[PDB]
């Protein structure tokens, strides 16, 4: 029995934008959280159905890790049950959940002088998603009775727009990195 490791999940670089996020699966390793307890400087922990004491001596049947780059208002939005652009369009998260949620502030790395446009998010949808499903699509949005015929024109918008993060960023706006883990307590 050996290390997982967590460092490849947490410490690694250039992780995904809010849509087309990624899912990773973890098995057959020692938990050894104490290195996380010592090393972590993370500005938020919140755990649902579990407590940080009574956390060692637990066996988790499956472990999944999901990674995001986010603007701090979304950091409050990522809680279950909320409303907002994210909760309506992207990464809906259910109230019935057993995980714990981690965030730390990456402004020294993720922000860019002149903006880090590569982080992309979706602004209009005909209906709102069920939890844990993606969309990777483009079908040009119509804001009138007449078609815009698959091309730009009147009342016709491309659904995608770019975040900007800068030096001297708005402290609530500036970028955050968020990681989520999901567990079930049914088998070793």
């Amino acid at each position: 029995t050996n290390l997982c490791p967590f460092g490849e999940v947490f410490n690694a670089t250039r992780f995904a934008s809010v849509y087309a996020w990624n899912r990773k699966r973890i098995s057959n390793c020692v938990a050894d959280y104490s290195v996380l307890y010592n090393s972590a400087s993370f500005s938020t922990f919140k755990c649902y159905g579990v407590s940080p004491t009574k956390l060692n001596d637990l066996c988790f049947t499956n472990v999944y890790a999901d990674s995001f780059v986010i603007r701090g208002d979304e950091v409050r939005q990522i809680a279950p049950g909320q409303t907002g652009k994210i909760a309506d369009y992207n990464y809906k998260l259910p109230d019935d959940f057993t995980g714990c949620v981690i965030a730390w502030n990456s402004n020294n790395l993720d922000s860019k002088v002149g903006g880090n446009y590569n982080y992309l998010y979706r602004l209009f949808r005909k209906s709102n998603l069920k939890p844990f499903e993606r969309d990777i699509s483009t079908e040009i949005y119509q804001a009138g009775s007449t078609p815009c015929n698959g091309v730009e024109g009147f009342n016709c918008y491309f659904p995608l727009q770019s975040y900007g993060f800068q030096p001297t960023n708005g402290v609530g706006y500036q970028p955050y990195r968020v990681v989520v883990l999901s567990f079930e307590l049914l088998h070793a």
Partner: antibody, heavy 113, light 105 residues
């Protein structure tokens, strides 16, 4: 063409002041950003840089007395003036523009002191 | 962040003698841009994030790095004459320009 051009470069004098202007054509100063970089003779370059839509300013300098941006925002030119610049600085002065990325264009001006 | 640079003084006997470029930095930097200069006159031309080239430069370049240290590797032809390199960081102000000197003859 998309262009940066250098205009009234400073010329030799016993007086230690020097002036230089740079001029831009094929894009507006309200649409992109332009950055200003200096080289001492026999040395690497030295930098002053700011990012704006218009009218904004950012600076870091080892010295800043008499120093803030000088600009003629009719698109005509950008201007530099310092009392002692002839001895202190500016063997060559360079005029440069940046966009989102991979659209970065450079112009070179030569200053006599 | 201050950045520090090393360079050799070297005499070649053929092309294909491999070449390395290095920069070392005082503190964490996330984004860097990669530039080559010819001596004597100093227009500027850029190789940007993900180390993709701009227009008008040979295809044989690749860059990958580790924190506080950046590397890209070149193998053949005109770069033996043409390459002098500068490294600059774009994560926070001031944008320090860096310094050094390099030659091959």
């Amino acid at each position: 063409q998309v262009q940066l051009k250098e205009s009234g470069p400073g010329l030799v004098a016993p007086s230690q002041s020097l002036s230089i202007t740079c001029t831009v054509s094929g894009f507006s100063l309200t649409r992109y950003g332009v950055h200003w970089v200096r080289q001492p003779p026999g040395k690497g370059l030295e930098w002053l840089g700011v990012i704006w839509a218009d009218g904004s300013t950012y600076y870091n300098s080892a010295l800043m007395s008499r120093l803030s941006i000088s600009k003629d925002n009719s698109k005509s030119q950008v201007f530099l003036n310092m009392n002692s610049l002839q001895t202190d600085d500016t063997a060559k002065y360079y005029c440069a523009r940046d966009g989102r990325g991979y659209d970065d264009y450079w112009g070179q001006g030569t200053t006599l002191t | 962040q201050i950045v520090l640079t090393q360079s050799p003084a070297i005499m070649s006997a053929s092309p294909g003698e491999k070449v390395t470029m290095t920069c070392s930095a005082s503190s964490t930097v996330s984004f860097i841009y990669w530039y080559q200069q010819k001596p004597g006159s100093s227009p500027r031309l850029l190789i940007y994030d993900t180390s993709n080239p701009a227009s008008g430069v040979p295809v044989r370049f690749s860059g990958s790095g580790c924190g506080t240290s950046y590397y890209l590797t070149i193998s053949r032809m005109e770069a033996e004459d043409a390459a002098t390199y500068y490294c600059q960081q774009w994560n926070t102000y001031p944008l320090t320009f860096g310094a050094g000197t390099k030659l091959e003859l």
